[PDB]
Design a binder for this molecule. Structure first.
Ligand SMILES: CC(=O)N[C@@H]1[C@@H](O[C@@H]2O[C@H](C(=O)O)[C@@H](O[C@@H]3O[C@H](CO)[C@@H](O)[C@H](O[C@@H]4O[C@H](C(=O)O)[C@@H](O[C@@H]5O[C@H](CO)[C@@H](O)[C@H](O[C@@H]6O[C@H](C(=O)O)[C@@H](O[C@@H]7O[C@H](CO)[C@@H](O)[C@H](O[C@@H]8OC(C(=O)O)=C[C@H](O)[C@H]8O)[C@H]7NC(C)=O)[C@H](O)[C@H]6O)[C@H]5NC(C)=O)[C@H](O)[C@H]4O)[C@H]3NC(C)=O)[C@H](O)[C@H]2O)[C@H](O)[C@@H](CO)O[C@H]1O
Ligand SMILES: CC(=O)N[C@@H]1[C@@H](O[C@@H]2O[C@H](C(=O)O)[C@@H](O[C@@H]3O[C@H](CO)[C@@H](O)[C@H](O[C@@H]4O[C@H](C(=O)O)[C@@H](O[C@@H]5O[C@H](CO)[C@@H](O)[C@H](O[C@@H]6O[C@H](C(=O)O)[C@@H](O[C@@H]7O[C@H](CO)[C@@H](O)[C@H](O[C@@H]8OC(C(=O)O)=C[C@H](O)[C@H]8O)[C@H]7NC(C)=O)[C@H](O)[C@H]6O)[C@H]5NC(C)=O)[C@H](O)[C@H]4O)[C@H]3NC(C)=O)[C@H](O)[C@H]2O)[C@H](O)[C@@H](CO)O[C@H]1O
Ligand SMILES: CC(=O)N[C@@H]1[C@@H](O[C@@H]2O[C@H](C(=O)O)[C@@H](O[C@@H]3O[C@H](CO)[C@@H](O)[C@H](O[C@@H]4O[C@H](C(=O)O)[C@@H](O[C@@H]5O[C@H](CO)[C@@H](O)[C@H](O[C@@H]6O[C@H](C(=O)O)[C@@H](O[C@@H]7O[C@H](CO)[C@@H](O)[C@H](O[C@@H]8OC(C(=O)O)=C[C@H](O)[C@H]8O)[C@H]7NC(C)=O)[C@H](O)[C@H]6O)[C@H]5NC(C)=O)[C@H](O)[C@H]4O)[C@H]3NC(C)=O)[C@H](O)[C@H]2O)[C@H](O)[C@@H](CO)O[C@H]1O
Ligand SMILES: CC(=O)N[C@@H]1[C@@H](O[C@@H]2O[C@H](C(=O)O)[C@@H](O[C@@H]3O[C@H](CO)[C@@H](O)[C@H](O[C@@H]4OC(C(=O)O)=C[C@H](O)[C@H]4O)[C@H]3NC(C)=O)[C@H](O)[C@H]2O)[C@H](O)[C@@H](CO)O[C@H]1O
Ligand SMILES: CC(=O)N[C@@H]1[C@@H](O[C@@H]2O[C@H](C(=O)O)[C@@H](O[C@@H]3O[C@H](CO)[C@@H](O)[C@H](O[C@@H]4OC(C(=O)O)=C[C@H](O)[C@H]4O)[C@H]3NC(C)=O)[C@H](O)[C@H]2O)[C@H](O)[C@@H](CO)O[C@H]1O
Lengths: 361, 361, 361
């Protein structure tokens, strides 16, 4: 039972009014399409007989893997360290800065600049301008001006200057001059306040010869110059005092040596010369005396004894009675006592009485 | 022309219908127009539709995201590891060696004079000016002399612990001044303590044309008993003073000037005063003499020559015979010789040689 | 009421079957359940199926796996070879410069005072103490004075090669002491060698209240010929010594003789003043010098000589020249007198030849 269906060309159906029954199939001889029938509608307006639709296609494949990445950044640059090097130089053998500048700083502060020290020869040259205790030579004026320095007056250790020769031969001091002339003496002592209760020079001699000795030497031409000259203006005291304790010798010994051999050269020369004068100005005169002999305690010796070649020629005794030597003279009359023995001077009351007592008887 | 109709339902009515299509019989969906065939042993639900083919495969996927950037390579190795090959190597020559330098400094610390061990110029100076100079100075203390085996010569020209030589300089050798109202000692003092001392205390060897030594006491405000020179001796075997002279035409010249204008002020004054005394500490008496004139060689001049206004008034001659001037007196008797001249005193042996020679015849 | 089934084979058997479907006849596959229409002139194998339309395209695929991480970057650049850019560079600042130091050291050795060329503190002192100080000292050698153009003044107030001023200090100016048993010279010595020296050797300008110059010889163990003062002159034209005074009372020169012993007759040969006139020591034939010479160029009214003993007058010469004895005298000769005009006056011979021949009657 091979059944064929109602069929036309695909176009012939569209132009046809033939109505297929509800359930009757209609065919398109072109391409093979087909539809059913709606028993009251033309072929154009009725459903075809297709299937639903196929299922969903498979999901696509998986994409190609991504490209490999880019090269990372370059490494950081190298570093060079001192300590890890080889042949490092030894720094120890180098002088530290601070320690050195400190050593030098202490040196400039602790050491003696040349300009602040005397050299050996500089020290010497300035020393030789100074007196030494082993000797020296002073050319200038050496003044002494003590002041509350406790200078004691002892005649053994004191004095502003003290020379002690008890352990050394020689002299203490010499003052020598070879000058023809000058304008002043050598040594000078002076006190100006008349209340000064002390001496100018003091000599406490113990020894075996002349204590103080003054000598004038024989001059070329003689002239009036004395070896010692004393002068006083104190009217209440003698100009000079001499005391002695001689046993057999004179306390003051004056001697006159003849300058010439011929005996009569020194006929006007004396051993002791006295001259009494008046005031050298307003003076009216003088009643002064020449020689004053006395023995306030009383003597038995002769108050004056003139001699010549050790032979007596004139003397006065303690009684006051003199004894001449040769022929004398009196320019006057001599008052005597009555002659009581064959030699006694004859008065006049003797010559008369014995002239008249021969009253022839 | 047997028009065949087929089995047909609505799309829903098929699912709930029990109609079993025969093996090959067609079934219709009056809705969708879909259709299936038959299994003659199955409901419509279980008969497979007439689906279409499967759709095509989906597009291939995209492409993966690019990979991450790579990692940083390792850091570079250091340059050189030997010191010698480095660049800009420092010049070590410009650095001071340690030992060589500390030795240089040490030689200085040993060769130079610390300040604390040397007097400065000003430190030395202050001690220099405290010492005596040869150009002058001012001594405030006591300058003692104590020579000992120092070769002090005794020469009167160069010796002495002090020697002053003014042969090339005007002025005085030494001056000793005091303006004090009072003190407890003199100025200059000479003293010898060993009574065996065989030398002088002071020696003056003067050669010149004026007074060698000159002593003057000046006029005091109020007079008193003070002498310009005072001599004292306790050596019983020698004179207290010695004077020798060679005067051609007086050896010792004594002069008394009247202190006042009035002629009789000095009425009790003498030029030379003598006194003979006993021992002051138990003396019984004295047999000493006053004045002793002599001429061991023999003189022709007068042993005593008194004058007044240069007019002779009394003199003793070398013969021993005096010669008065005016009227005298004898409180006693004068023994004389028999008168062998027209003048001459009368004895008694010549008054009575004539008083008897006139017998009566 | 007939039900039509269609022509059907297995799905494979159709492809290998020669059956030709009629135009519109449907053919069935007993397998898959598919079916096709007819071509009226085609085998089943070459006939379009009766399916629905094509399914839709599948979903796009997923995204590929992300790419791998990149490769490690290149190595870093190498380290540096310059000293300045090194790491852990040593600090050179702490090192002393060579030249700056060698310059510092050189300047020091030239600017500072080597030890061997300067006296130490102790050497300067040891050499200082050998020099005299102005506050005191002990001179052991000879201190010479040799002034020359030194402006040495001669003033008796400030001048002199040495000048001592004690106006501000108690005590003595100068002391010369000796304790030696014997020596070869005196202490102080003054000497002028040119006999033209027109000035004095020593000068004492004293103002005060006691003895100006004071000389003392002390009692020796054994007495001997030693004088406290000794004058000697060789000038035939000038006195050896000069004394001037202005005394109101007392003698200008006071001589006193004290007996050394208690026995009254111990000093029987001793005098106060001793005079001796002698010749020249080298050939004198004699001398005509005088002993004592009193005169008063101004004229005196007092007595030229007044001898006393126990303060009672015993002999005196007056200004007239008339003496006055005390007791009995003697004349080894004849005494020329005047004719007696009074009863006591001595009688001559022409007075005893007179009153005799007046008895020639
Ligand atoms: C013509 C006529 O007839 N006219 C009549 C008139 O007669 C005349 O009258 C004159 C008149 O007016 O006076 C008269 O002149 C005096 O004659 C006498 C004769 O006896 C003279 O002696 C006197 O001269 C001197 O004058 C002075 C003076 O004026 O001041 C007296 O004073 C003395 O001055 C000196 C100067 O400064 C002093 O130094 C001195 O002091 C003493 O020093 C001693 C000393 O050496 O240090 C002391 O003693 C101890 O000494 C021993 C010595 O060995 C030492 O060892 C001690 O030291 C110790 O010892 C030692 C040691 O040895 O190793 C170690 C220890 O460590 C040490 O400490 C000494 N002591 C100490 C301190 O330690 C002593 O204490 C001091 O005092 C001072 N005094 C003395 C005593 O010397 C002198 O004394 C005196 O001699 C004449 N004066 C004057 C003014 O002229 C004539 O002689 C007459 O003919 C009639 O008088 C009048 C009426 O009466 O009428 C007229 O008409
Ligand atoms: C009243 C009465 O009639 N009473 C009677 C009594 O009479 C009295 O009795 C007295 C008595 O007791 O004797 C009598 O005599 C005098 O008495 C007193 C004292 O006693 C004096 O008036 C006198 O004595 C004088 O003084 C002293 C003294 O006595 O103390 C004598 O001694 C002298 O002392 C000084 C000090 O020490 C000595 O220095 C001196 O020696 C000399 O020194 C010189 C010196 O400068 O040091 C020396 O000259 C240098 O020599 C050398 C050597 O070569 C040369 O080289 C130098 O030259 C220089 O050389 C060089 C060189 O070498 O590089 C470089 C230069 O270019 C160059 O210049 C010389 N220097 C020069 C030239 O510048 C010299 O050699 C030394 O000798 C010492 N003298 C001596 C001799 O040792 C004095 O000599 C003496 O004058 C007594 N005499 C006299 C005439 O007055 C009284 O006259 C009477 O009143 C009766 O006696 C008794 C009897 O019973 O009875 C009574 O009644
Ligand atoms: C046997 C017989 O009968 N004989 C006869 C025989 O005799 C002759 O006659 C005499 C006799 O018969 O006895 C005797 O001869 C003389 O007798 C006198 C007796 O007095 C003797 O003095 C004399 O010796 C002479 O003495 C004088 C003297 O008087 O001093 C000496 O002269 C002086 O010499 C020294 C050495 O050169 C000098 O130092 C001195 O110069 C003066 O010194 C003054 C002073 O005082 O210091 C100074 O004045 C100062 O000046 C200044 C400036 O104005 C002031 O600043 C100072 O003032 C002070 O200033 C201050 C201050 O500045 O802040 C503070 C104060 O407030 C203030 O005051 C002044 N003054 C002071 C205090 O500083 C200055 O330096 C000078 O002016 C000098 N001048 C003086 C003082 O005059 C002589 O050197 C000395 O010779 C006897 N002569 C001799 C040679 O020995 C003899 O026996 C015989 O000559 C007959 O010849 C014969 C004939 O036939 O017959 C016989 O019978
Ligand atoms: C008339 C008469 O005087 N008699 C005759 C005598 O004349 C005097 O003799 C004495 C004499 O030689 O005995 C002498 O005296 C000295 O004469 C001078 C001048 O008159 C006189 O200056 C003397 O004193 C001196 O004075 C001075 C001075 O500078 O002033 C220094 C002397 O140191 C000092 O002595 C005086 N007296 C002395 C002490 O000598 C002199 O001859 C006459 O005055 C005469 O010489 C003889 C003849 O042979 O005959 C007598 O009749
Ligand atoms: C014109 C005349 O001569 N007058 C008669 C007078 O003669 C004088 O007598 C006095 C006297 O005895 O006092 C004598 O005095 C001596 O000389 C002077 C001054 O008097 C003086 O040296 C002495 O007097 C005393 O000396 C002393 C001492 O201790 O020695 C201390 C006193 O300072 C002082 O008062 C004295 N003698 C001595 C030792 O120096 C004087 O020389 C006589 O000329 C006479 O005494 C009377 C009668 O009795 O008559 C007058 O007309």
């Amino acid at each position: 039972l091979r059944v064929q269906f109602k069929r036309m060309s695909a176009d012939e159906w569209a132009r046809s009014d033939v109505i297929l029954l509800e359930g009757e199939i209609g065919f398109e001889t072109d391409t093979g399409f087909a539809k059913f029938g709606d028993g009251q509608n033309t072929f154009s307006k009725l459903k075809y007989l297709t299937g639903p639709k196929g299922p969903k296609g498979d999901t696509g494949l998986q994409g190609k893997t991504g490209g490999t990445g880019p090269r990372g950044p370059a490494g950081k640059p190298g570093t060079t360290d001192y300590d890890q090097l080889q042949n490092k130089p030894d720094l120890g053998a180098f002088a530290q800065k601070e320690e050195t500048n400190s050593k030098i700083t202490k040196l400039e502060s602790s050491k003696a600049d040349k300009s602040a020290v005397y050299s050996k020869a500089e020290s010497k040259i300035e020393l030789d301008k100074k007196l030494s205790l082993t000797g020296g030579i002073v050319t200038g004026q050496l003044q002494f001006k003590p002041n509350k320095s406790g200078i004691k007056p002892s005649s053994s250790v004191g004095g502003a200057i003290n020379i002690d020769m008890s352990k050394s031969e020689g002299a203490a001091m010499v003052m020598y001059t070879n000058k023809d002339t000058t304008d002043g003496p050598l040594m000078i002592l002076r006190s100006d306040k008349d209340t000064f209760d002390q001496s100018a020079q003091f000599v406490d001699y113990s020894g075996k010869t002349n204590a103080v000795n003054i000598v004038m030497r024989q001059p070329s031409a003689p002239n009036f110059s004395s070896a010692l000259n004393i002068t006083s203006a104190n009217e209440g005291g003698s100009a000079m005092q001499i005391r002695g304790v001689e046993k057999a010798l004179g306390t003051l010994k004056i001697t006159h040596e003849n300058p010439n051999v011929e005996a009569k050269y020194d006929e006007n020369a004396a051993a002791l010369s006295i001259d009494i004068v008046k005031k050298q100005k307003g003076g009216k005169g003088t009643a002064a005396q020449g020689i004053y002999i006395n023995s306030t305690s009383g003597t038995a010796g002769k108050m004056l004894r003139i001699r010549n070649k050790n032979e007596d020629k004139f003397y006065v005794g303690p009684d006051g009675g003199f004894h001449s030597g040769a022929n004398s003279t009196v320019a006057g009359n001599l008052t005597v006592k009555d002659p009581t023995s064959g030699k006694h001077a004859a008065t006049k009351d003797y010559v008369d009485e014995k002239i008249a007592e021969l009253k022839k008887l």
